[PDB]
Amino acid sequence: MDVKVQYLCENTQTSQQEIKGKFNIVNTGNRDYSLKDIVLRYYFTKEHNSQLQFICYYTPIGSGNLIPSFGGSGDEHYLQLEFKDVKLPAGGQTGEIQFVIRYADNSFHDQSNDYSFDPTIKAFQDYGKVTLYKNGELVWGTPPG
Numbered sequence: 001m002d003v004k005v006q007y008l009c010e011n012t013q014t015s016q017q018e019i020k021g022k023f024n025i026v027n028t029g030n031r032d033y034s035l036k037d038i039v040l041r042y043y044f045t046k047e048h049n050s051q052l053q054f055i056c057y058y059t060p061i062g063s064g065n066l067i068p069s070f071g072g073s074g075d076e077h078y079l080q081l082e083f084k085d086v087k088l089p090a091g092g093q094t095g096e097i098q099f100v101i102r103y104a105d106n107s108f109h110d111q112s113n114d115y116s117f118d119p120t121i122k123a124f125q126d127y128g129k130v131t132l133y134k135n136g137e138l139v140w141g142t143p144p145g
Contacts, residue, residue: 001139002029003088005040007127010098012119014112019044019101023081024124025132026093035065035083035094039133042081042099043144044114045074050103054079060095061086075115075144096124115144 004026011020023040027033046052054068067082079101088094103109111117116129132140 001033001134002031003027003033003038003132003134004126004140005130005132006124007116007118007121007130008096008124009117009119009121011111012122015108015110017102017106017108019099019109019111019114019117021099022124023097023099023130024093024095025088025097027088027090030090032090033088035061035086035088037134038083038088040081041078041131041133041143043072043075043078043116043129043131044101044109044111046070046077047074047109047113048103048105048107050105050107052079053102053104055100055102057098057100059097061097066097075113078116 006024008022052070056063065084065086069080072078128141130141131143
């Protein structure tokens with residue numbers, strides 16, 4: 001599969017109450033796909049026992065089409081995004097998917113520990129520290145060690 005993810009960092013503050021940024025999924029090949037087959041991961045370390053919340057402020061694909069969860073043990077720890085059946089035509093792109101992560105109890109989080117955190121990227125760039133998997137196979141990026 002030829003698909004990549006672009007990343008944009010919105011909240012660049014090291015210590016804060018929310019991780020915030022944007023993903024853009026792009027189809028770089030000649031075949032049509034569906035987002036239902038794509039799993040996306042953004043890696044960060046969970047330092048508090050509080051329940052985590054994912055919030056999508058806005059997306060063109062529509063936010064009802066996101067299937068968010070959390071997983072791993074830090075930092076293999078991550079936010080995972082899955083998707084309902086949303087077409088990604090060959091050569092096409094989702095456009096922005098805003099993501100916010102907070103602790104339910106509004107605790108602070110240190111981003112300097114997060115594998116996928118890169119405040120130098122202030123506009124969408126191909127970004128390899130956020131991963132895409134298709135049916136369990138890693139097709140884009142590199143996971144943490």
